[PDB]
Design a protein around this ligand. Sequence first.
Ligand SMILES: Nc1ncnc2c1ncn2[C@@H]1O[C@H](COP(=O)(O)OP(=O)(O)OP(=O)(O)O)[C@@H](O)[C@H]1O
Ligand SMILES: [Mg+2]
Lengths: 109, 447
Amino acid sequence: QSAQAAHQALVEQLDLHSIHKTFRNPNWRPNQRRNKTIKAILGESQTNIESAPSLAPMKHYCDVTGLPAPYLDPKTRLRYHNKEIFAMIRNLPQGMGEQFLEARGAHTV
Amino acid sequence: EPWKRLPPPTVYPVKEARFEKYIPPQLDGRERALAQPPGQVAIVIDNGSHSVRAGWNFEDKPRLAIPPIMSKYRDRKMGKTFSFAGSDCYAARSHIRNAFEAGTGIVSNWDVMEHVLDYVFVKLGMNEDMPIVMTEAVANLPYSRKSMSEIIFECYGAPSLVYGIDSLFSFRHNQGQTGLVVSSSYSATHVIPVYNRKALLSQAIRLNWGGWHMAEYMLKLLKLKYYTGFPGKLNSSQTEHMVRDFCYVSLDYDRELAGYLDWTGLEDRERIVQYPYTEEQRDWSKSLLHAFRYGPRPFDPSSQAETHRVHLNVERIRVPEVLFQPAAIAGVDQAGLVEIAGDILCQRLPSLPGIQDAPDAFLRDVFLTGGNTLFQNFDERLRQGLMALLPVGAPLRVRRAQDAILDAWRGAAGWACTEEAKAAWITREEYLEKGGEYIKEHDLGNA
Ligand SMILES: Nc1ncnc2c1ncn2[C@@H]1O[C@H](COP(=O)(O)OP(=O)(O)OP(=O)(O)O)[C@@H](O)[C@H]1O
Ligand SMILES: [Mg+2]
């Protein structure tokens, strides 16, 4: 079908692999281990010291809706706005509470 | 009942990163480069984690803007390898890899990066030698600079290279003499004090929140809101366009938030994006979660048109506010943007003994850069936050860059061939002497 043939023609027109990069040095070949992670690059040091913690009091927001939360559930550890959302929170499926914590990046796994 | 009286909803089709058209090699660019005076040409690469922007120093805008992605695979139905390294890679099989470590400003997949540079030079029309100006991250890691230097010198044979900071090129392009540069970008957010055109990078701070984190966080929120199971495929490429189109910074978060889901007026605090569906006395009207999920109107799962749409509501404002309230809203456990800028202006710069007229000289130009500042009210929110911390009547001004995305490239292009820049260039022979960790320290670059 012409539409598929046109798609192949476009895919060929977009392809870089068919093109010889005259400006490349053919002799140079990288160390394949060069793709280190930042964790590894830092750990090899033994300036990304620009991070900044905080000490101001933290306002409390509802884990379900993001509205302000007066209440913290001692069971699920979710913060909730009102008793309707408390009804939801304790009716959550088996793994869903951990997902709401993960949006805060809290975890108990 | 009010929902009978409300109009039909207005709904926006879901946008996503997509291929639009092929662009050929721009041979007129190579021609113009050979026509310029000697020593007044460079290839300028704003190596942004959201877009690589590339062009000629003698031109007013980049010729290329592409994601730092490659797709390479063998078509089992044709027996040949295909490779793609920009928006030719459709972000149709999406074997995508990205040059950057996700949520950081640092290049780490050098194979993708080298393919991206191949695409850049091909589409700039190089076929066989030109000075290269390239932006790097603030405090870019030495190992990362080495690897990029090796590629530029040893693979591509370029005569000269220099590394600057996109934030600082943007400041100088906007006549920045002295000020506090606030950059919020795809990878990160930075506050850098600049004194007499030189950045005091020992006093700069990084937030670790930016436009990538907002798209990811918006995705988490939507997957939670519809945890019963949204039938569309939710991608952070879509939520990026939602954050761009619909989110804005609150001028008064708690007072705007607490009323946001109020049934009156929610009709247009909500905004509705539709995914492409395949066409075939206490109740919902008093519930909060219906308003949160479905707004002022009745819902039925029978309508394929009313499924396959998400209602944004609180995340219209909740997403941008992570910059200001990082631990509260997303557990980022870092000082908010106003607290960071306040700490620099109030504590550091008055203490730093070499400086004169601190903070006041800096207050006269707090400067906003990078795409993730483009939220509405971002300036006024930042101004009012700082105004409470600064002494009464301090001459605080907050100013936006012109064209806050491309303007960082324009700064590098205008700087590229100045004598200050050419004093900062490293030649290949200097690289062969010193290796790629060495740099000429200069006003716009790392130490
Ligand atoms: N009008 C807009 N309003 C809000 N956000 C926007 C707007 N336009 C672009 N963005 C977002 O801002 C970011 C673009 O930032 P920018 O292009 O300045 O960074 P970069 O140079 O690619 O990255 P970095 O310096 O962090 O490596 C993206 O996350 C994009 O979705
Ligand atoms: Mg950038």
